[PDB]
Amino acid sequence: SDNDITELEERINQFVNLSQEKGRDATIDKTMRWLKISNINKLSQKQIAEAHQKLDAGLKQLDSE
Amino acid sequence: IRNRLSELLSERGLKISRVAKDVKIARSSLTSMAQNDSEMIRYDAIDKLCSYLHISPSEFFEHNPINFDFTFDEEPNYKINDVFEGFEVTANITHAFSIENFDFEILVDVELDNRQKLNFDLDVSYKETEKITNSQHRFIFTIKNEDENIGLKKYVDSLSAGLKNLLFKKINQKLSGYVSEIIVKNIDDIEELFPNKGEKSTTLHKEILQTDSRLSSDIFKE
Amino acid sequence: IRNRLSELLSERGLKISRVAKDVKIARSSLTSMAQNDSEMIRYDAIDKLCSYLHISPSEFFEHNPINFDFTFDEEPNYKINDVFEGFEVTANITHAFSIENFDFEILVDVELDNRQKLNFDLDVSYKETEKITNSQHRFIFTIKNEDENIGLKKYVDSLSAGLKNLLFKKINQKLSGYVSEIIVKNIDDIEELFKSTTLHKEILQTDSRLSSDIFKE
Amino acid sequence: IRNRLSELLSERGLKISRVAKDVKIARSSLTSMAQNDSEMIRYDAIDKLCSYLHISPSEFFEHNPINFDFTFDEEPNYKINDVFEGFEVTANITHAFSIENFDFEILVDVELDNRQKLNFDLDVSYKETEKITNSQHRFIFTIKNEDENIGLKKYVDSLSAGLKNLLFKKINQKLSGYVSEIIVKNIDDIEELFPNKGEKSTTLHKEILQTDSRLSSDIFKE
Amino acid sequence: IRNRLSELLSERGLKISRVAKDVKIARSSLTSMAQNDSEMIRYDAIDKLCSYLHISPSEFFEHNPINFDFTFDEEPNYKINDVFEGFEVTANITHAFSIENFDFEILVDVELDNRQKLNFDLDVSYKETEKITNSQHRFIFTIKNEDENIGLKKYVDSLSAGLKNLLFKKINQKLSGYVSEIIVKNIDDIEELFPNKGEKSTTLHKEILQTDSRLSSDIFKE
């Protein structure tokens, strides 16, 4: 779902950037490791939605931090 | 027993570095030995310090014949629910897991000057995961039978304030090590993917071992 | 600083093994620490000993504010004579060689309780070799300027007998290491053909002691 | 017979751990031996305990010369209908199967001090699969000829309460083992696909062996 | 503490085999347990014996609260000259070697009913390699400071004759094991080329381990 992979990619890169903005070193490969996905480009939609839940929660927590 | 270095230099007003420059003893070792935490001491060190401070070892070594030996349960009554609240994303012990309960028995064989030794049993249960900082937390335990061990408290408070603090340290350190050991065997590694402050990435293991659980009871107030 | 565990046990007749069993401490460590030989002591050890012996750490640790420091000349005045003959019969440094001269000054600071400290220079020259054993001979050095060290004797015997013996042991070791380092470099190894020892090893084992009115023991 | 450790330390008020710290005996072994269940004991153990408690073996060991030996039917009259109501999804013995009937004969060769031995026959029939917890159940049996074995009850109650409890334990344990053995041979493996509570996956076999069937009759009340 | 089986059946006049046939206990285990040497026993075994003999455990077990714990020197003062006079052709410990001297310290922490414990030091030296038979020898040791340990003897003789014999056995056995251990580490294997009597071939090691060194002193007469 190239539209989903762009949304997922934008959020995971946003999460990486926010971590770096927080001063916490962040790399895309690690945030992909959080999703434990082997290929972001090819994934089932439900997994993109499931991944979002992980990133959004994490993104919000650094906000509180 | 404990060296009174901290009390000695507080009374003198001198600093550890100043003493180290005077007695030619390594700053790190001397500052560690200044704290009662160090368990080993050198004869050269006691000679140099006693001479520098112009005092006999009497003032250097605070000794009380009442020996408090502590033993812990080989198997405790511990339940640790695992809550997967993004420990990796947030390095907080609460995010990694939570102690449902942690109760066990701490046997204290208090020994007077005479070989006569009195044993006190402590039903100690986990009470709360106190959050000292946003970064780390301290587990807090409580003695259910502390009222029974009122005589133990009488013996604890019968010692000097410095020796009382040394016991509290020893109890806290043993308890921390024990709790961290149990938890690290019960909880899988939860590595932190993103380092906080980019300084280092720490696995939950490093956090729980770093976590220092200090027992809280009227038996041990200070 | 003088552990009196040894003295205390002689007072109470308590065997070292008996104390080790009662205080749950290794016999080897307790016996090593008994004559204050080890330079490291565990807080647990002293705590257990004090509680067990019903003593304050005062009766365990005897300390005299006075401090003695010994500095040896970087370059000593030494001459060597190597016989190379008779070492083979049985370990004997004297047959293998001997030190014709080994005069050198040792700067000794006797520090008083007052920050001020007193510097005394003693010149010790090779006097003879002590035949303590046929296998081992200990070099003897005599103080030439004992006049400058008259106060040195007074400070030395001002300390307790145990402390005096401690000093004598330390100075003896230091002198032995000094002379062995100096000599082994100028001495070729001789194999003990008559379990296997090289004259170098002999030099290492051979010690030296300052025989003087200032240090009689 | 049984060591009176449980009764001894109840009277003393001491805890097993406290005794273990005193007599240098392993906590697990000592706590097991504290219960009358242990079938073996060490002279070292009896020496250390008798000395610690400052008591002769008389008090330490409670012995009644009346020996109750139990034998069970090689072949019982057992009918076990299989009703597989989702045992794999719900771990309840009821869901796995149900005992239509389980009657058999338990021969008890009660022996007095004298070699004179009296044998009592027990027509014991399954009565109900009592559900102790939502997780596990206890099979309940009943003696049809218990009124005939009224003399047996007279002999049972003629013993000490501790020894009576020890017999009840022995009878229950033998009966449980027997019943679980018969059922496990009669019922195929019904593995539990989903670990119970997710903590561990246990097969019906493990459940029935874990199941403890205690006989219920006026002969054995306590 | 020791089971008084030997004394019990001596008084009854019965034989171990006869008892074993009665209580269904293995002859070897029962005969070993009849001797005080056994360090382990079964509740089933005590139940059966107490019932068969119609006696309470009081008579069955003899316990004296005075506990004699023995400790030996980690390093002894031992000199063992090697004189190989054809040990392989003649299997005599004397032919294999000879003890020049074997002195060491045996610490006995005698404990009364109260935790108060008294320690007695035994300067024990090898005296003679007593030759019990032409085949084997017994090493004999002697306590130099036995006169100092006169109080120990007072405590030893204060016990029952059976318990005294049990101590003597324990002391002998520990001493034998210790001496054989030291010697076997100090003496190389001296295999016996010709089986002794042709029945079996035994190495010096087997001979010294078989060798049983019993201490001899007025402290321990019987």
Author numbering:
A (entry chain 4E): 140 to 204
B (entry chain 3E), D (entry chain 3F), E (entry chain 2F): 2 to 223
C (entry chain 2G): 2 to 195, 201 to 223
Text taken from the publication that reported this structure:
To parasitize a phage, the SaPIs employ a transcriptional repressor, Stl, which in addition to repressing the SaPI genes, senses an active phage infection by binding to the phage-encoded anti-repressor protein. Here, we show that the phage satellite SaPI2, which does not encode orthodox anti-phage defense systems, provides antiviral immunity mediated by Stl2, the SaPI2-encoded transcriptional repressor. Stl2 targets and inhibits phage-encoded HRs, including Sak and Sak4, two HRs from the Rad52-like and Rad51-like superfamilies. Here we have focused on two recombinases, an annealase called Sak, and a recombinase called Sak4, belonging to the Rad52-like and Rad51-like superfamilies respectively.
The most abundant particles revealed an architectural structure formed by fifteen Stl2 dimers acting as a molecular filigree decorating two heptadecameric Sak80α rings, keeping them apart and generating a ~ 1.5 MDa structure. As a result of the asymmetry between the number of Sak80α and Stl2 protomers, two Sak80α subunits in each ring were missing any CTD density while a further two had at least partial albeit extremely poor-quality densities, which were left unmodelled. The structure instantaneously elucidates how Stl2 is inhibiting Sak80α by interacting with and corsetting Sak80α’s CTD. To our knowledge, this is the first visualization of the α-helical bundle present in the CTD of a full-length Rad52-like annealase. An overlay of Sak80α models revealed that the CTD was fixed in two different conformations, either up or down, which in relation to Sak80α’s ssDBG might be seen as open (up) or closed (down). This flexibility in Sak80α, provided by the loop connecting α-helices 4 and 5, is suggestive of Sak80α’s mechanism to load ssDNA onto its ssDBG (see discussion). When Stl2 is present, two Sak80α rings are ensconced within a Stl2 armor, preventing Sak80α’s CTD from engaging with anything beyond the Stl2 cage. The two Sak80α rings are kept separated so that they cannot interact to each other, a proposed intermediate step for efficient complementary ssDNA annealing.
